[PDB]
Every structure is written in C-alpha cells, then in structure tokens.
Amino acid sequence: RLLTQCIRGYWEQSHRVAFVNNFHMLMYITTYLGNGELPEVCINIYRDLLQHVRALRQTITDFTIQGEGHNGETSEALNNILTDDTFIAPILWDCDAL
Amino acid sequence: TLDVQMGRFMETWADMMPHHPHWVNEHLTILQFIAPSNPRLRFELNPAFDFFVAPGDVDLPGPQRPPEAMPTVNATLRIINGNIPVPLCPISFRDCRGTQLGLGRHTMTPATIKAVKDTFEDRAYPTIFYMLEAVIHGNERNFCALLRLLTQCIRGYWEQSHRVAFVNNFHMLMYITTYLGNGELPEVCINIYRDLLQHVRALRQTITDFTIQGEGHNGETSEALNNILTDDTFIAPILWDCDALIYRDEAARDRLPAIRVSGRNGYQALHFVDMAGHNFQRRDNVLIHGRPVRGDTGQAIPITPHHDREWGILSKIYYYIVIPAFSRGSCCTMGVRYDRLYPALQAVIVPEIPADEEAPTTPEDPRHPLHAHQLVPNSLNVYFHNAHLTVDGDALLTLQELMGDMAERTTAILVSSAPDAGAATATTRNMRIYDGALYHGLIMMAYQAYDETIATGTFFYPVPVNPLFACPEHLASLRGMTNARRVLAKMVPPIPPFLGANHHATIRQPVAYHVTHSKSDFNTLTYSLLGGYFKFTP
Amino acid sequence: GLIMMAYQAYDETIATGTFFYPVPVNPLFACPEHLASLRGMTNARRVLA
Amino acid sequence: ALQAVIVPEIPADEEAPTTPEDPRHPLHAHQLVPNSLNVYFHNAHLTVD
Amino acid sequence: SNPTTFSVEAIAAYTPVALIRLLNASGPLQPGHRVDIADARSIYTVGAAASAARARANHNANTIRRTAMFAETDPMTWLRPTVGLRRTFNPRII
Amino acid sequence: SNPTTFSVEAIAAYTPVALIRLLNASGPLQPGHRVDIADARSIYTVGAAASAARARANHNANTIRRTAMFAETDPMTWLRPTVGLRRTFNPRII
Incomplete structure (x- = not known):
C-alpha cells in the first residue's frame, strides 16, 4: 500500500518514474503492481524497460552458437560476459549470485 | 495422466x-x-x-x-x-512473397496490433482468464450462461490497462464476436475482436483465391488438395470438441487413418459428464464432447458435430497464422489439472443480501464480495482480487449453473494418415505422417517465473506439441527441472515422442525458425506465413 | 424481398432460417454462405455452390 | 411473432420511464418474458419507450 | 446430520456437508492423521458443490427465474417462434 | 517501568521504554552527561521498536488479520490449493 501510494504520488506530480534505481524493484513492481493498482502509463514504462532488457538478452542469444560447451560452461557464457556466471553485479542484495 | 508420461x-x-x-x-x-x-x-x-x-x-x-x-x-x-530448409529458401524471400500476396487484401489497423501485442506480451496476465478458459472449455451452452461475469471481467481488464482479454482460444473470440457484439462491451473492444476475425476471414479468402476449383480427386476437395489450412486431415493444436475428429474420420476415407488416444486405438465420445460420474482419475479412451444445445443428450444418440466445417478452417488459420505471427515462439501449449482446479472453484463467499434491498456495486461497502471483510484466505475472491477486477454477486454465482457440465482431464491425441491422393505413389503410401494435439488443453501467452502468489505447476504443466508452440522457459513449471534440463532444452525444442517427431510431422522446424527469427511487420508476417502453407504436391 | 449484408451461422439465439430463406437472383447477389439457412443442406451441395 | 408486446399498464399521473433500471420500463427484467418483442430488442441491446 | 458426527478431517468423514463460508479447512487440520486415504478427494468436492447449491437456498426471491438460453422447442412452435434470452441483464426483481 | 526510574539520557537508560510519540528526545537533553557510552544505541533501538509494536495495542480492532501472504502449506493441500492475499486493500473493518 505504501509503495503504491508513494509511486502514484510521485508520478502524478512531476510525470517522472520512481524506484527505477534497483533491479530488484522493477521485477517486483512489474509482477505485483502491474495488474491495475497503478495508472496505465506507469506500468507501460516498467514493462517497456523490462522488454528492452529481455530484448538485449535475446540479442545475446542470437549471436552465439549453442551446443559447444567446454568443461562445464555453456557456449552463451563462453561468448558473452553478461551471461557469464563468474562475473557478478556491481551491487548485491541477496547471496544467490555468489 | 500426462504427468507420469512427461516425467518419463x-x-x-x-x-x-x-x-x-x-x-x-x-x-x-x-x-x-x-x-x-x-x-x-x-x-x-x-x-x-x-x-x-x-x-x-x-x-x-x-x-x-x-x-x-x-x-x-x-x-x-x-x-x-516452406519445409524446404531456411538456408535454401530464405526468410527475406518469404517476406517479399507475403508482401506480394497481401497487396490489396485486408490489413489490421495499428490499434488492434498494439493492443493484441500488448496482451501477448503481458507477463502479468491474470490467471483468472486461464482458469475460465479451461473451465468454460468452448461450449456454447456453458459460455452463454456466464455472459454477465464474462462481460464484467473483460470490461474490468480493458478499462485499466487497454489490453484485450480472452484472445487466447478460438472458441472464445468467435463467441464474444457473435454474442457480446451488439453493444454490451465498449466500442473499441468489439472493434478489435471484429478486426481480428475479419483478418482471419481475409486469409481464408486469400486461400480460396489462389486455387482453381472443380478438380476433386477421390472425394477430396480442391482446397484441401492445394492447401493445408483447408485440409480436414490436419487438425488444430488444441481440440475442445470432437467435431474436428469426426470431420477427419469421414473426410479422409481412402488415405489410411489411425488414432491413438491415451493407449488403445480409437475414441469413444461420451458427452455430458456431471457431478454424478466425473471420475477425475479416468484412464480409458473416452473424450468429453460437451453438451449439445439443439436436442437431447441421451445414451444411444450418436455424436453430432457442433459447428460447420468452416469453423475448423478458421480455427486452423487462427492457430497456425495469427498466434505464431504475434507471439513469435514464446507461447507454449499445455494441459491443465482439472482435479486440482475444481475444488478451488467451489469456494465463493458471496454474502446473503437482505430482501427489498439493492445489490452493492462498488467494492467499498461491506456487502460487496470483494470487500476486505469477505477476503478469506484460499477462496475464489482472493483469486479475483489478486487480478484487481470488480464483479457482482450473481456474476460469481453463475458458476453453480456452470457446474452441471464439466471436463474430466486433458489427454494427448496422436492421429496419423497416408499422404493424400495428390501424391499417392506406391512407394509414397508407406511414408506416413504423424502429428499431435491436446484435447482440453490451453496456451498461456508468456510465462511469469517470479509471481509467487500462486505456486508454480499448481494448475498447468508444460506439454508442447508443435515446433511453433515450443517453450524453452515454460519447462520450469514442470516438476523436477534442473539446470541441465534447461540448457539441453534451450537449443532443441522439446517435443515428446508420444506426440510425433519433427521429421514425421506436418509443420516442421523451418516454419518455426521463420516465425521466430523474422522482424518485418505484423501483416506481412501473417501473409508470408499463409504463403508458406501451400503444398508442394504436384 | 430483403437483402442482408452478411450472414452469421454461429448465432444460436435465433433458429436457423426462421424468418428468411435464400432465393438469390443476380450474379452480383450470389451467396455461398447464405445457403446454410435452407432446410436440407449437405456438404456436396455446399461445395458445388 | 410481432403481436407480443409487454408494455406495462403505467398508472395515471405518473411519468413515462426512460432508463431501463426501473420496474416500469418495458426492457426491465421484470417485464422481460421469453418469446416477445422485448427479448428481440434486448438481444440487440437497444432501448425504446 | 447426526450421528456421523462432524467432519474433523479425518478421512471418514461425512459426505454431506451442508455448511457455508467454512473457515474450517483453513483453519487447522492439523495435519491429517494416520489413515490410508484415496477419496476423500471427490467426496469433498461433490459435497461442497451440493453444499453451495443448497447454500443458494435464498437468492431465488431475487430471481427472475431461469430462461430458455437459445432458440429451441418449446413444444408448440406453430404459433410462436422461440427466442432465447442472452442473460446480460441484472436479475434483482426487488 | 518502575522503579528504574525514567530515561533521562544518561546511558542506563531503561531498556523498555514504554512511551508513545515522544517529544522527549528533541526535546532537551541538554546534552548528555559525563559517562563512557557506546550502547545506548542498540538498547535504545530495540526499546523503540518494541515501544511501537506495543504502541499498536489498538488498531487491531480495525484488522482484518494478517494472512498467508504467498502460496505455501496450509498443512493439507490435498483437497484445496493455497493462494494468499496481496495486500492492496484498505484494512479497516469499520
């Protein structure tokens, strides 16, 4: 309730998007606050940002050749870095990356 | 029960x-x-x-x-x-050919394109639509009984996100267009539905235009002898009624048919199952036809098909053109868990209104079913309030009138036939074609892996049979999926061998590669996909 | 006589061919899908029409 | 199939109903009997007096 | 209703079950005891459905009874063509 | 609460801290006395949180109790699926 009211207050006062900061914020906003609790324009912005992230991931997938993995490492991680599990995010909230 | 088979x-x-x-x-x-x-x-x-x-x-x-x-x-x-491999027949050539076909034909206005793309793209799509599509299961006397609740739910979903609901199934779009089209729904929604249906009929007319009639061999029409979307032997990926199997059985009659429905050969088609004999753990080869409305059920009365032959043609055109050209290989065909679903559908908490009183409309007063007083844990109103929709008491109470007709469980149907009389050579008769379908199955639009309000694999489990409807990410809903299973399923589309393989199927891998790796348009893609489905028989 | 704009065969709230029956006279006003409202319609006559 | 109207006997010194939410209207569910013209007009969602 | 006596869940349990708005399933159980089980499952379901159709009971003084759905006999049809109601109105009758 | 006697800050201070909406801190101090100090800080914090959880006291006549949140057992799950409330409603019971 507090998150919904705060984002609605920040949006219909300056037409700017709140909480675009953390990655573990727009997953949660898109999954939970996407069924109609927010105005139509905000959830479209969050869904479009998520669309662009997944489009970049799909672009990484197209430019590699699968099926050639060496020593327990997939080919997509062996081609790119953003799919390489050794390289970690600049900030961490939960220990799953380690 | 299609779970042990998939796990094996x-x-x-x-x-x-x-x-x-x-x-x-x-x-x-x-x-x-x-x-x-x-x-x-x-x-x-x-x-x-x-x-x-x-x-x-x-x-x-x-x-x-x-x-x-x-x-x-x-x-x-x-x-x-178009089953000629993509390095031999390129994607750009197919797109230019599809542009050539759709020169003066009907195109869709960009509003319908944007709305339907936004619906297929919606990862926060409410599962209430999925359960209602699984439970209504494309029956006329079952859909028309819930007309008010369907109207309220569609109007609630549209005037909060500007997206078009129930565009999943084909016995949902046609029913909405025929019944809810006189003005119950708002002006823009029925325009989008009618534009989709008109585009389907334009594709059908394009199939009819590019052939020459009057040439029918061995009781097979010229349309089926030229095209596949007008072929009765080839069937839709999801069957809701047994009419398509009836038309398949009586239409072929010379090319050697065979059917395998959960073990033994042949189907039974016993309709009108109720609470008396539902028997969720049923093992035999019986298929629930659903209640006919123009007559009596009986016991010795044979099964009469619900709709005309043109319904099957429109169904195949829709499922093999419009859904792949918009979804682009993200949607996955699946069966439901009815025995896990119906006990969750009996829990409504509609209160007892006093007599000589008016029904509440807004959810602010205590008498509303969606108010905070009536939101008990593990009910159906928590399911509705998760989707943030507003319905009335009678709209929730029409499920009791639904409940007289039900569906038992989904099953896997593998039909097979010889090649048609156009290419029937004494050495070609042995090369049979095997293709599969799901009876009483569904397709979700895109899979949400992080919605933890509903446990994964509770209602739907992934069983894909089409290379167009393969799903690399939906397999996390299956019980017991590891990293190795995901990485081996990423590169190969998982099609189980009890539903036909790629090299024996009709729709093969190059059509899927064309639909998932082309970035041209949404009208030219549809006309290119139609121009693909033209037979290479002499 | 009347002219209808487009025939619907999937509206079951009115029985098929209750008030109108197809009797077309023009090549312009021919109707392949309106013949489902005549009593005694089969597959052979439909595909021949 | 046209002789069956369910227009109610409106009392004198009372105003004619326009919206269909009141029981005095012909298209209210109280005055919506099967097999009449009221079901024909309500199937098309058109409001008349 | 008695003596059977009351569903405590248990696997016995009793087949109707004529309650409504039950906060009994969840609720404690807590959990099920050392009984074999198979069914249970459908017995509860057909019990609950008939215990909600019986929990209608009233809401029929608000009807506006059931209608003919589509156009069908209606055993005369020689004076009056049948037309069914599409139930998109609000049945409240007041 | 008594006899300890009352947090005058000081560093003793007294660990609950059973006051509400205190304008005690700012407020005069003015400032703290000649003591060692480090904690203080933790003892104040655990007392302040407890003196807000206790300062709820009422407003549970307005709940609308907390629920299962997410989908989890719910110790049967063999006759009914489990789905929790996503709290976006206004809990007031009135």
Whole structure:
C-alpha cells in the first residue's frame, strides 16, 4: 500500500518514474503492481524497460552458437560476459549470485 | 495422466542426447550450407523429400524405449513448401512473397496490433482468464450462461490497462464476436475482436483465391488438395470438441487413418459428464464432447458435430497464422489439472443480501464480495482480487449453473494418415505422417517465473506439441527441472515422442525458425506465413 | 424481398432460417454462405455452390 | 411473432420511464418474458419507450 | 446430520456437508492423521458443490427465474417462434 | 517501568521504554552527561521498536488479520490449493 501510494504520488506530480534505481524493484513492481493498482502509463514504462532488457538478452542469444560447451560452461557464457556466471553485479542484495 | 508420461520423457531425455541434432541447425547461411564440411549436404537430394537416419525393422509407432537397431536411411514427404530448409529458401524471400500476396487484401489497423501485442506480451496476465478458459472449455451452452461475469471481467481488464482479454482460444473470440457484439462491451473492444476475425476471414479468402476449383480427386476437395489450412486431415493444436475428429474420420476415407488416444486405438465420445460420474482419475479412451444445445443428450444418440466445417478452417488459420505471427515462439501449449482446479472453484463467499434491498456495486461497502471483510484466505475472491477486477454477486454465482457440465482431464491425441491422393505413389503410401494435439488443453501467452502468489505447476504443466508452440522457459513449471534440463532444452525444442517427431510431422522446424527469427511487420508476417502453407504436391 | 449484408451461422439465439430463406437472383447477389439457412443442406451441395 | 408486446399498464399521473433500471420500463427484467418483442430488442441491446 | 458426527478431517468423514463460508479447512487440520486415504478427494468436492447449491437456498426471491438460453422447442412452435434470452441483464426483481 | 526510574539520557537508560510519540528526545537533553557510552544505541533501538509494536495495542480492532501472504502449506493441500492475499486493500473493518 505504501509503495503504491508513494509511486502514484510521485508520478502524478512531476510525470517522472520512481524506484527505477534497483533491479530488484522493477521485477517486483512489474509482477505485483502491474495488474491495475497503478495508472496505465506507469506500468507501460516498467514493462517497456523490462522488454528492452529481455530484448538485449535475446540479442545475446542470437549471436552465439549453442551446443559447444567446454568443461562445464555453456557456449552463451563462453561468448558473452553478461551471461557469464563468474562475473557478478556491481551491487548485491541477496547471496544467490555468489 | 500426462504427468507420469512427461516425467518419463524428461528423465529419458536427460541422457538421450549425445550431440546436437542435424535438423536444428537452420541458422546457417547459404555459403555454409553449400560448404563441403556440412554433414547434412549429402542427404539433401530431392526438393519434396527429407532424408534422415532411422532405426531398422521398427514399426512406427513403437514402444517407449527405442530398440537397438542398425541405422538405415528413411525418407519422408515435405508437405509444406516452406519445409524446404531456411538456408535454401530464405526468410527475406518469404517476406517479399507475403508482401506480394497481401497487396490489396485486408490489413489490421495499428490499434488492434498494439493492443493484441500488448496482451501477448503481458507477463502479468491474470490467471483468472486461464482458469475460465479451461473451465468454460468452448461450449456454447456453458459460455452463454456466464455472459454477465464474462462481460464484467473483460470490461474490468480493458478499462485499466487497454489490453484485450480472452484472445487466447478460438472458441472464445468467435463467441464474444457473435454474442457480446451488439453493444454490451465498449466500442473499441468489439472493434478489435471484429478486426481480428475479419483478418482471419481475409486469409481464408486469400486461400480460396489462389486455387482453381472443380478438380476433386477421390472425394477430396480442391482446397484441401492445394492447401493445408483447408485440409480436414490436419487438425488444430488444441481440440475442445470432437467435431474436428469426426470431420477427419469421414473426410479422409481412402488415405489410411489411425488414432491413438491415451493407449488403445480409437475414441469413444461420451458427452455430458456431471457431478454424478466425473471420475477425475479416468484412464480409458473416452473424450468429453460437451453438451449439445439443439436436442437431447441421451445414451444411444450418436455424436453430432457442433459447428460447420468452416469453423475448423478458421480455427486452423487462427492457430497456425495469427498466434505464431504475434507471439513469435514464446507461447507454449499445455494441459491443465482439472482435479486440482475444481475444488478451488467451489469456494465463493458471496454474502446473503437482505430482501427489498439493492445489490452493492462498488467494492467499498461491506456487502460487496470483494470487500476486505469477505477476503478469506484460499477462496475464489482472493483469486479475483489478486487480478484487481470488480464483479457482482450473481456474476460469481453463475458458476453453480456452470457446474452441471464439466471436463474430466486433458489427454494427448496422436492421429496419423497416408499422404493424400495428390501424391499417392506406391512407394509414397508407406511414408506416413504423424502429428499431435491436446484435447482440453490451453496456451498461456508468456510465462511469469517470479509471481509467487500462486505456486508454480499448481494448475498447468508444460506439454508442447508443435515446433511453433515450443517453450524453452515454460519447462520450469514442470516438476523436477534442473539446470541441465534447461540448457539441453534451450537449443532443441522439446517435443515428446508420444506426440510425433519433427521429421514425421506436418509443420516442421523451418516454419518455426521463420516465425521466430523474422522482424518485418505484423501483416506481412501473417501473409508470408499463409504463403508458406501451400503444398508442394504436384 | 430483403437483402442482408452478411450472414452469421454461429448465432444460436435465433433458429436457423426462421424468418428468411435464400432465393438469390443476380450474379452480383450470389451467396455461398447464405445457403446454410435452407432446410436440407449437405456438404456436396455446399461445395458445388 | 410481432403481436407480443409487454408494455406495462403505467398508472395515471405518473411519468413515462426512460432508463431501463426501473420496474416500469418495458426492457426491465421484470417485464422481460421469453418469446416477445422485448427479448428481440434486448438481444440487440437497444432501448425504446 | 447426526450421528456421523462432524467432519474433523479425518478421512471418514461425512459426505454431506451442508455448511457455508467454512473457515474450517483453513483453519487447522492439523495435519491429517494416520489413515490410508484415496477419496476423500471427490467426496469433498461433490459435497461442497451440493453444499453451495443448497447454500443458494435464498437468492431465488431475487430471481427472475431461469430462461430458455437459445432458440429451441418449446413444444408448440406453430404459433410462436422461440427466442432465447442472452442473460446480460441484472436479475434483482426487488 | 518502575522503579528504574525514567530515561533521562544518561546511558542506563531503561531498556523498555514504554512511551508513545515522544517529544522527549528533541526535546532537551541538554546534552548528555559525563559517562563512557557506546550502547545506548542498540538498547535504545530495540526499546523503540518494541515501544511501537506495543504502541499498536489498538488498531487491531480495525484488522482484518494478517494472512498467508504467498502460496505455501496450509498443512493439507490435498483437497484445496493455497493462494494468499496481496495486500492492496484498505484494512479497516469499520
């Protein structure tokens, strides 16, 4: 309730998007606050940002050749870095990356 | 019960694969396909045939575990001319051909394109629509009983996100267009539905235009002899009624048919199942036809098909053109868990209104079913309030009038036939075609892996049969999926062998590669996909 | 006589061919899908029409 | 099939109903009997007096 | 209703079950005891459905009874063509 | 609460801290006395949180109790699926 009211207050006062900061914020906003609790324009912005992230991931997938993995490492991680599990995010909230 | 079978398939498939398949490598360009290091190049000889390696002395279909055999080379017929591999017939050529077909034909206005793309793209799509589509299951006397609740739910979903609901099934769009089209729904929604239906009929007219009638051989019409979307032998990926199987059985009659519905050959078609004899754990080959409305059910009365033959043509056109051209290989065909679903559908908490009183409308007063007082844990109103929709008491109470007709469980149907009289040669009759479908199954639009309010695999489990409807990410909903299973399923589309394989199916891998790796438009893609589905029979 | 704009065969709230029956006279006003409202319609006559 | 109207006997010194939410209207569910013209007009969602 | 006596869940349990708005399933159980079980499952379901159709009971003084759905006999049809109601109105009758 | 006697800050101070909406801190101090100090800080914090959880006291006549949140057992799950409330409603019971 507090998150919904705060984002609605920040949006219909300056037409700017709140909480675009953390990655573990727009997953949660898109999954939970996407069924109609927010105005139509905000959830479209969050869904479009998520669309662009997944489009970049799909672009990484197209430019590699699968099926050639060496020593327990997939080919997509062996081609790119953003799919390489050794390289970690600049900030961490939960220990799953380690 | 289609869960043990899928689990056995994955547990066998974990170590079944020692190398990458030769029919997946369709990302090659022309100069790499022509290059002498290509191992597939020796097996590409005749443009209307696919040559592969097959087990010897094996009578298809065989047992669950393939017997050891000496490998021999078996051929099969390329029914589609778009089944010619993508390095030989390029994507850009198919797009230009589709532009040539759709020159003066009907196109969709960009509003419908944007709304339907936003619906197929919606990862926060409410599952209430999925359960209602699974439970209504495309029956006229069952859909029209819930007209008010469907109207309220569609109006609630549209005037909060500007997205068009229930565009999943084909016995949902046609019913909405026929019944809820006189003005109950707002002006913009029915325009989008009517534009989709008009585009489907324009594709049908395009199929009719590019053929020459008056040439029917062995009781097979010219349309089915030229095209596939007008072929009665080929069936829709999801069957809701047994009418398509009836038309398949009486239409072919000379090309040798066969059907396998959960074990033994043949179907039974016993309709009108109720609370008396539902029997969720049923094992035999019976299929629930649903209640006919123009007559009496009876027991000795044979099954009469619900709709005209044109409904099947529109169904195949929709499911094989419009859904792939918009979804682009993200949607996955699945069966539901009815025995896990109906006990969750009996829990409504509609209160007892006093007499000589008016029904509440807004959810602010206590008498509303969606108010905070009535939101008990594990009910149906928590399911509705998760989707943030507003419904009335009678709209929730019409499920009792629904409940007299039900569906038992989903099942896997594998039909097969000889090639038609157009290409029936004494050596071509042995090369049979095997394709599959789900009775009483669904498709979700895109899969949400992080919605933890509903536990994964509670209602729907992934069982894909089409290369167009393969799903690399939906397999997390299956019980017992590891990282290795995901990484082996990422490169190969998982199609189980009890639903037909790629080299024996009708719709093959190059059509899926064309639909998932083309970025042209949404009208030109549809006309290119129609121009693909033209037979290469002489 | 009347002219209808487009025939619907999937609206079951009115029985088929209750008030109108197809009797077309023009090549312009021919109707392949309106013949489902005549009593005694089969597959052969439909595909021949 | 046209002789069956369910227009109610409106009392004198009372105003004619326009919206269909009141029981005095012909298209209210109280005055919506099967097999009449009221079901024909309500199937098309058109409001008349 | 008695003596059977009351569903405590248990696997016995009793087949109707004529309650409504039950906060009894969840609720404690807590959990099920050392009984074999198979069914249970459908017995509860057909019990609950008939215990909600019986929990209608009233809301029929608000009806506006059931209608003919589509156009069908209606055993005369020689004076009066049948037309069914599409139930998109609000049945409240007041 | 008594006899300890009352947090005058000081560093003793007294660990609950059973006051509400205190304008005690700012407020005069003015400032703290000649003591060692480090904690203080933790003892204040655990007391302040407890003196807000206790300062709820009422407003549970307005709940609308907390629920299962997410989908989890719910110790049967063999006759009914489990789905929790996503709290976006206004809990007031009135």
